[PDB]
């Protein structure tokens, strides 16, 4: 406890000395409090105007206007402690799981080097302004790597000075660059090195990109089994446990020298220990400490969601197929049987799952997975908007199954070959390409904006009548070599400035595993649409009279828009699309 913290906390005290109260009406149960001192401050979301001039019929489709308008109270719960079989049955899967993800990796520290070049191309870090303006200025001046260094040989001296988090179903938490540097040292292995990848974990499907996720969950169909499971957890962050964070730690039992040291630093003093500091408008800064939930860098937070949801979901597969009987106690016999399933057959049940963070589908053995609850409801992963101890329903059709917000679609070419596409109501894809984050956009980061969501439509969504129209009409309204641009950065083949058939060929043929004849398409006219049914039922406008003068007048809206861009070179990708060509 407060040996850990303590230092932390009594460094903040004395940088808000005037300030520091320890307050009576805090309105912490679960968060240990240890005092409060004055603040006042907080972004919204903005409209991107180019999109929206050109999707004119959805100005009156409140799904996609509602999108740019705008439970604390789950942050603030406690998850009890698991029994003592289900912490023997995580601690033998955790040190399994670990063993096979390493059998072909090697942990290693990442670099300065790395880090630099990560912020001098904006991912988004979760760091904060203070002493330098951004994170591209503190990582040139030398003064910031001295700070970094006496808070590394106090890590090596096991104890913490400056990691602290700032809080603000979306809960993030931010620390200053030096502390995310000191994480990604010790920890960026697992995303930079693909330690999720579907070829390194089975079950994961870190790197595969939107257009191998639907090919993925149809080859998860081909097993022999039950129905496909895709129970979400009910506010997963929250409902890590201490005993996760500990099965999580034993990455660096396969570690050694400084970096053992530097990694068993952060899980100790950063992650089973937390520093947080909340903006209460009663205005106070609140300084609050708990051992348990996640609350890591957003990238770390990724690769050790997936690891505990693999975890977690082996776990209830054992379940099902009855290697033990009660999470009550495990018998010393139990332990060999879960033991000898993981050797036998635990690469078998990995493949049977796709698992990006909290998010899984699970093609079990049979159903009897359905009714498997006792480990996954102790574990604390409780399942959303289901009873307890309801069955699970399950889904017949891999074309029905909901993940990572899609579904996917079995779409034939006119020649025969077939392609799995990623799909989502065409709402929210408007909705969301009409939003931009922050301020200070000039009309071109604007435009390049919009220019990154129409390549996206054309490589991903191509398939949808209404966002095949809208990306040609974006590309045809911004120049043609103005660069596509975003804020925080899946694979993204659409961020180029390569003609986007040239890009589908590469991404939907000659790249595509699961396409065996290579012949390249020639045309957009030989890439096929959902029949329109489908298209309507995925929330096409086709077959209404906004939608009908919006494609016909297509050349006025984006007039409109290039007129506002001014005189610059476009190029008209309309004739692509067979209605326009003459
Ligand atoms: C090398 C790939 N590539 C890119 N990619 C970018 C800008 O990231 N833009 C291109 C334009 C023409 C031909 C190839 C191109
Ligand atoms: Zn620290
Ligand atoms: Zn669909």
């Not at 998850?79 to 995580?90: A, C, D, S, V, W």
């Not at 129970?231 to 409902?239: I, P, Q, S, V």
């Not at 070179?569 to 003459?582: A, C, I, L, V």
Request: include cysteine; charged fraction near 30%; hydrophobic fraction near 35%.
């Amino acid at each position: 406890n407060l040996d850990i913290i303590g230092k932390r906390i009594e460094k903040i005290k004395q940088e808000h000395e005037t300030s520091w109260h320890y307050d009576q009406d805090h309105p912490y149960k679960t968060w240990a409090y240890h005092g409060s001192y004055e603040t006042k401050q907080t972004a919204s979301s903005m409209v991107n105007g180019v999109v929206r001039l050109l999707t004119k019929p959805w100005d009156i489709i409140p799904m996609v206007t509602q999108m740019a308008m705008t439970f604390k109270e789950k942050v603030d719960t406690r998850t009890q402690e698991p029994k003592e079989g289900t912490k023997k049955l995580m601690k033998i899967t955790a040190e399994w799981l670990w063993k096979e993800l390493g059998k072909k990796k090697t942990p290693r520290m990442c670099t300065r080097e790395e880090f630099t070049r990560k912020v001098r191309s904006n991912a988004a870090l979760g760091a904060i302004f203070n002493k330098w303006k951004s994170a591209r200025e503190a990582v040139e001046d030398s003064g910031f790597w001295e700070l970094v260094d006496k808070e590394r040989n106090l890590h090596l001296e096991g104890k913490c000075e400056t990691c602290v988090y700032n809080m603000m179903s979306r809960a993030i938490w931010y620390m200053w660059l030096g502390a995310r540097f000191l994480e990604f040292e010790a920890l960026g292995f697992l995303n930079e090195d693909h330690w999720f990848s579907r070829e390194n974990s089975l079950s994961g499907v870190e790197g595969e990109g939107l257009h191998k996720l639907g090919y993925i969950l149809r080859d998860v169909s081909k097993k022999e089994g039950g129905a496909m499971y895709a129970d979400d957890t009910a506010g997963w962050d929250t409902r890590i446990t201490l005993e996760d964070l500990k099965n999580e730690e034993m990455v660096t039992n396969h570690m050694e020298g400084e970096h053992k040291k530097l990694a068993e630093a952060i899980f100790k003093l950063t992650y089973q220990n937390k520093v947080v500091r909340v903006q209460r408008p009663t205005t106070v800064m609140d300084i609050i400490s708990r051992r348990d939930q996640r609350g890591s860098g957003q990238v770390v937070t990724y690769g050790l969601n997936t690891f505990t949801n693999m975890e977690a979901q082996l776990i209830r597969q054992m379940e099902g197929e009855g290697v033990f009987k009660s999470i009550q106690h495990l018998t010393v016999t139990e332990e060999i049987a879960v033991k000898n399933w993981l050797v036998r057959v635990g690469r078998e049940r990995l493949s049977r799952m796709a698992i990006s963070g909290d998010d899984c589908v699970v093609k079990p053995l049979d159903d009897r997975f359905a009714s498997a609850l006792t480990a996954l409801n102790d574990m604390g992963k409780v399942r959303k908007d289901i009873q307890q101890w309801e069955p699970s329903r399950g889904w017949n059709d891999w074309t029905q199954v909901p993940f990572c917000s899609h579904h996917f679609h079995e779409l034939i070419m006119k020649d025969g070959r077939v392609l799995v596409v990623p799909c989502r109501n065409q709402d929210e894809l408007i909705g969301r390409a009409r939003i931009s984050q922050g301020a200070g956009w000039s009309l071109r980061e604007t435009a390049c904006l919009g220019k990154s969501y129409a390549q996206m439509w054309s490589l991903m969504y191509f398939h949808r009548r209404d966002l095949r129209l809208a990306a040609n009409a974006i590309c045809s309204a911004v120049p043609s070599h103005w660069v596509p641009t975003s804020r925080t950065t899946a694979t993204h083949e659409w961020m180029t400035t390569e003609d986007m058939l040239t890009v589908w060929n590469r991404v939907w043929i000659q790249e595509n595993p699961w396409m065996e004849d290579k012949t390249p398409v020639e045309s957009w006219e030989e890439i096929p649409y959902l029949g329109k049914r489908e298209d309507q039922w995925c929330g096409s406008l086709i077959g209404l009279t906004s939608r009908a003068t919006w494609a016909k007048n297509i050349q006025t809206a984006i007039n409109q828009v290039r007129s506002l861009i001014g005189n610059e070179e476009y190029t008209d990708y309309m004739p692509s699309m067979k209605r326009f060509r003459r």
